[PDB]
Design an enzyme around this catalytic site. Structure first.
Site, PDB file in Angstrom:
ATOM      1  N   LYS A  78       9.372   5.834   6.044  1.00 17.89           N
ATOM      2  CA  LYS A  78      10.860   5.721   6.530  1.00 17.89           C
ATOM      3  C   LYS A  78      10.751   4.435   7.879  1.00 17.89           C
ATOM      4  O   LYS A  78      10.085   4.777   8.633  1.00 17.89           O
ATOM      5  CB  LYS A  78      11.464   6.833   6.941  1.00 17.89           C
ATOM      6  CG  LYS A  78      11.674   7.849   5.961  1.00 17.89           C
ATOM      7  CD  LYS A  78      12.367   9.022   6.439  1.00 17.89           C
ATOM      8  CE  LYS A  78      12.682   9.991   4.953  1.00 17.89           C
ATOM      9  NZ  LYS A  78      13.303  11.259   5.450  1.00 17.89           N
ATOM     10  N   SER A 132       9.603   1.581   7.684  1.00 21.61           N
ATOM     11  CA  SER A 132       8.357   0.927   7.565  1.00 21.61           C
ATOM     12  C   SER A 132       7.566   0.573   6.208  1.00 21.61           C
ATOM     13  O   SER A 132       7.608   1.612   5.429  1.00 21.61           O
ATOM     14  CB  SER A 132       7.222   1.336   8.627  1.00 21.61           C
ATOM     15  OG  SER A 132       6.670   2.584   8.004  1.00 21.61           O
ATOM     16  N   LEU A 140       0.867  -1.268   0.198  1.00 26.00           N
ATOM     17  CA  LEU A 140       0.091   0.033  -0.014  1.00 26.00           C
ATOM     18  C   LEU A 140       0.727   1.298   0.057  1.00 26.00           C
ATOM     19  O   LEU A 140       0.362   2.278  -0.632  1.00 26.00           O
ATOM     20  CB  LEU A 140      -0.804   0.142   1.176  1.00 26.00           C
ATOM     21  CG  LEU A 140      -2.140  -1.159   1.250  1.00 26.00           C
ATOM     22  CD1 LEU A 140      -2.823  -1.152   2.634  1.00 26.00           C
ATOM     23  CD2 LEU A 140      -2.957  -0.781   0.392  1.00 26.00           C
ATOM     24  N   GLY A 141       1.854   1.351   0.560  1.00 25.09           N
ATOM     25  CA  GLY A 141       2.936   2.459   0.960  1.00 25.09           C
ATOM     26  C   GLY A 141       4.213   2.029   1.670  1.00 25.09           C
ATOM     27  O   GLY A 141       4.353   0.984   2.173  1.00 25.09           O
ATOM     28  N   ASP A 180       3.176  13.906  15.247  1.00 26.80           N
ATOM     29  CA  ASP A 180       3.299  13.681  13.956  1.00 26.80           C
ATOM     30  C   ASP A 180       2.027  13.825  13.116  1.00 26.80           C
ATOM     31  O   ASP A 180       1.723  13.377  12.185  1.00 26.80           O
ATOM     32  CB  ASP A 180       3.941  12.399  13.471  1.00 26.80           C
ATOM     33  CG  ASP A 180       4.626  12.390  12.238  1.00 26.80           C
ATOM     34  OD1 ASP A 180       5.051  13.485  11.780  1.00 26.80           O
ATOM     35  OD2 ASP A 180       4.565  11.287  11.604  1.00 26.80           O
TER      36      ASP A 180
END
Ligand SMILES: CCc1ccccc1-c1ccc(CNCCc2nc3cccc([N+](=O)O)c3[nH]2)cc1Cl
Ligand SMILES: CCc1ccccc1-c1ccc(CNCCc2nc3cccc([N+](=O)O)c3[nH]2)cc1Cl
EC number: 2.7.11.1
Lengths: 327, 324
Positions: B46, B48, B42-43, B153
């Protein structure tokens, strides 16, 4: 033609479908660190070819457990290390933290997570029905996990289960006899401790599996709920099968050996005799009735069976009504 | 420097036992990843990688995040925070903690989210839609702050939205931390465009109010259709871009109040700037998302002084949300 083959009803091909790296422990490279980072405090126990110590890690002031191994068989040390590395972090499994050697002795040593063991001798007098159900469920989480990882413990017994009762924490320890399950493989029957050995080991049936651990767990349950330690008190390995036959009966023993075409050793000829199948309710007395229930006896009956294939798997055991009261 | 503390949930972690917040002592039980089959990537972040997967025991879709074990203490922290917040409003749900038998790589299993494209929402969004989803983010923030946790974040990449079902989830708790009054924290947190002034001037005694600055940066980008709102090219330049909107006068008042020593790298780049009116950012392409209520709310979030910003609780009572 010889004995009839057998295989596990669960996790049968988990190792077959994994690369050799996982299960070929003989090819595993062990990196031995410096033991100077640990200071030995006191001796906890002394086993066969091993001594266990409480120690302190000098770099963070934390307590650890150090197991010093007598290097009698180098292949056996590689097996235990690989299994501990594969199971590292699993539920209720002792956690391998480091692998070290003292600079002068060069003796192999394993460093584990600290466990604050409660003295059980005073504990079983105060144990309740709920406590037994709770801790039995914790052991089953460890067993379903290691079996799913393609590993049989092969030495399940009270000495290898550490409990910190204050924190309700349990750990399954001493993976020195553990082995990888490969379907159709013939294993050494000289495993487990006498009182906990399954009928398969006692009749020399080598094609056993994870179900051996489920027999040993049944022996532990029977000794706790009936306050009879050990439950099956053999004086040697042949006499151990006679002690089991005095409870399970000789009729079902002959059905077991016939199903797998097992040849009974001639040493059983004058000692086995004829024995009726006993009712589990016959072991209930005034001192243990507060730990016994219809659910507990039904669960015990489904673990202590001659036929290794007919015993509940760890996952099936977790779904039994005996555990309906636990989280 | 001058000591500071949160105006809300100040001592929530103080009155809880050590088990709650001492992540370093937390015991993580790693299950077997064999119960999950990976479907597609999916993505890739950094340290992960996120994958869509299927749980073979119940035929349900899940999200599996594979972590690069660069710092073991950081993994324990994220897990403890996810366990503490499990089931909270609009918080991503941790379902399992597993490792592959051969690789032994740490992996986190989450609930499945059917996300709608971010670059696709931007055009059809209405004033009501912005109000609704801003309130949904506020429910997650007031909850995690009440639980003594600051996300650190907050940004659009960390907010997943299923527009069809009007469902929102705050994700990626890797940089999250427990708030303890008087504690000095690492300022190397959050994504450049969303870093609060406290992080940029190296003021370590910050709190939950850091998340309210980031939320302010998100609102400004949406209502004005200006992405990002404060476009710094490095961490030093980021402070200059905020100073171009809030002025250099209020920045010195902030600095003097907390006795902050400004890094010499700001000497040749900071300059002198005037305080701008929020109405100056209104144009033909964004006027349908702007209102006096929206500008008043934005002005109360984007303030240099972390103590002066609205709390998630105070923000939820603002007239901007009277229609939700
Ligand atoms: C009795 C079987 C049983 C059945 C059902 C439920 C629980 C148990 C049980 C399970 C575990 C224990 C406690 N066993 C402690 C064993 C042990 N304590 C130790 C203390 C120090 C060292 C040790 N070592 O092996 O090196 C060590 N080993 C006590 C009991 Cl009662
Ligand atoms: C209308 C709400 C709003 C108000 C104000 C400012 C911004 C927005 C907004 C606009 C768009 C989005 C959507 N962001 C999606 C980011 C994302 N999409 C993903 C898809 C897959 C994986 C992802 N991951 O990080 O793991 C992932 N992350 C979220 C939000 Cl909150």
């Amino acid at each position: 033609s010889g004995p009839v083959p057998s295989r596990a009803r669960v996790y049968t091909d988990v190792n077959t479908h994994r690369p050799s790296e996982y299960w070929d422990y003989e090819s595993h490279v062990v990196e031995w660190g410096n033991q100077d980072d640990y200071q030995l405090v006191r001796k906890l126990g002394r086993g066969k070819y091993s001594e266990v110590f409480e120690a302190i890690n000098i770099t963070n002031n934390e307590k650890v457990v150090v197991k010093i191994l007598k290097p009698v068989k180098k292949k056996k040390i590689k097996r235990e290390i690989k299994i501990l590395e594969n199971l590292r972090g699993g539920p209720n499994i002792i956690t391998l933290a480091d692998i070290v050697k003292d600079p002068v002795s060069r003796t192999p040593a394993l460093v584990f997570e600290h466990v604050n063991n409660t003295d059980f001798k005073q504990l079983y007098q105060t144990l309740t029905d709920y406590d037994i159900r709770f801790y039995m469920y914790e052991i089953l989480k460890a067993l379903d996990y290691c079996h799913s990882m393609g590993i049989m413990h092969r030495d399940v017994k009270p000495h290898n289960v550490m409990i910190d009762h204050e924190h309700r924490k349990l750990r399954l320890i001493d993976w020195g006899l553990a082995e990888f399950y490969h379907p159709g493989q013939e294993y050494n029957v000289r495993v487990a401790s006498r009182y906990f050995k399954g009928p398969e080991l006692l009749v020399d049936y080598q094609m056993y599996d994870y179900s051996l651990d489920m027999w040993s767990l049944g022996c532990m349950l029977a000794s706790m709920i009936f306050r009879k330690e050990p439950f099956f008190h053999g004086h040697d390995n042949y006499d151990q099968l006679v002690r089991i036959a005095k409870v399970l009966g000789t009729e079902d023993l002959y059905d077991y050996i016939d199903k797998y075409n097992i040849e009974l050793d001639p040493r059983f000829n004058d000692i086995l005799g004829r024995h009726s199948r006993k009712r589990w309710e016959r072991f209930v007395h005034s001192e243990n009735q507060h730990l016994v229930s219809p659910e507990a006896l039904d669960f015990l009956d489904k673990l202590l069976r001659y036929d290794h294939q007919s015993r509940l798997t760890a996952r099936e055991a977790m779904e039994h009504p005996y555990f309906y009261t636990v989280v």
